[PDB]
A = this chain, B = another copy of it.
Amino acid sequence: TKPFTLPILTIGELTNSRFPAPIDQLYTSPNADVVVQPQNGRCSLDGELQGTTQLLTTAICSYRGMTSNPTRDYWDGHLLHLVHPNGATYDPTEDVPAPFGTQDFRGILYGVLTQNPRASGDEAANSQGVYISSTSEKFTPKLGTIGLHQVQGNIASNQQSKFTPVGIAVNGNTPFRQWELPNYSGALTLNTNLAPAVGPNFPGEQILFFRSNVPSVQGGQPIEIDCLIPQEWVSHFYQESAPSQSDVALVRYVNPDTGRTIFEAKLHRQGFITIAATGSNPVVVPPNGYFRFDSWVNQFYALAPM
């Protein structure tokens, strides 16, 4: 059958699948107190996209649609009636948690809303700084609408609009919680069509994440976002569609200069990596190294500890 492969891309050549930013660290953690169930950056090793995952970096935490008329709400002064980022009409009966690329954390996403060109406006006339909070009860993307909180400039009513994400905001009552899913249809309604939760299934193992330090626009602290596989892997697996020969592919992080293995890991067919490690640490790698497919193994392959 068609051989499974990983793209030859170093850590500085990878993009986060859950926020449009370069990967800057590998990271591991027990995450004891959380269900790790992201919806972006979800794709099986044989190329099946899941959750809200799609192929473009530009659609991740992006939104597109028609703005409403003004609301009475102090925070969400306008609603956005969603379409998919590729422009396709969105039907809530679709097999998805929400439109593709929808943010998959509880917290405040910051970015810029652009709408109808403004012939007469001054500088930045058609670019509004906007907060999209996934703890708002107006955050109901499954139903086809989310709330917009303007923070710089003024949102125009009833216009075709685009939201380009820039960063994360944290205010007094909205911590950034990357492993808590939004309520895609609002509180007291169940989420649907989710990519499954992930985690280790062999003693002494933890998930290894691809991590990005992303812009922090309010709150004062650095913000970290972990994805299970980078966007380029999503793209690669979708292109290749190599049949998975077992539940686990043994991969090695290799230094191409020396041919030496920095460490080995298990890449599960569902699309996440586990390593033999304990505790919350970065995993240090040579800038020129990258994962290489070694062989198909099983869930009991005993990894060399890090």
Contacts and interface: CB of A to CB of B under 8 A. Distances in A.
Interface of A: 7-9, 12-13, 15, 20-22, 24, 55-59, 85-88, 110-112, 114, 117-127, 129, 131, 151-153, 162, 164, 166-167, 169, 171-172, 215-222, 232, 235-236, 239
A61 B183 CA distance: 34
A288 B86 CA distance: 13
17 contacts: A7-B239, A12-B87, A12-B88, A20-B20, A20-B58, A24-B87, A110-B124, A114-B215, A117-B222, A119-B220, A121-B172, A123-B169, A124-B218, A126-B218, A127-B217, A127-B218, A164-B167
Given A117-B221, A218-B124, A218-B126, A112 B58 contact: no
- State the copy count for this chain: 2
What are the 5 closest A-B residue pairs judged by CB atoms, nearest first? A119-B220, A114-B215, A57-B57, A127-B217, A12-B86
A220 B125 CA distance: 9
A58 B127 contact: no
Contacts of A123: 131, 151, 169, 171, 218
Contacts of A13: 55-56, 86
Nearest to A64: B22
Contact of A124 (B129, B221, B239): B129
Contacts of A87: 12, 24
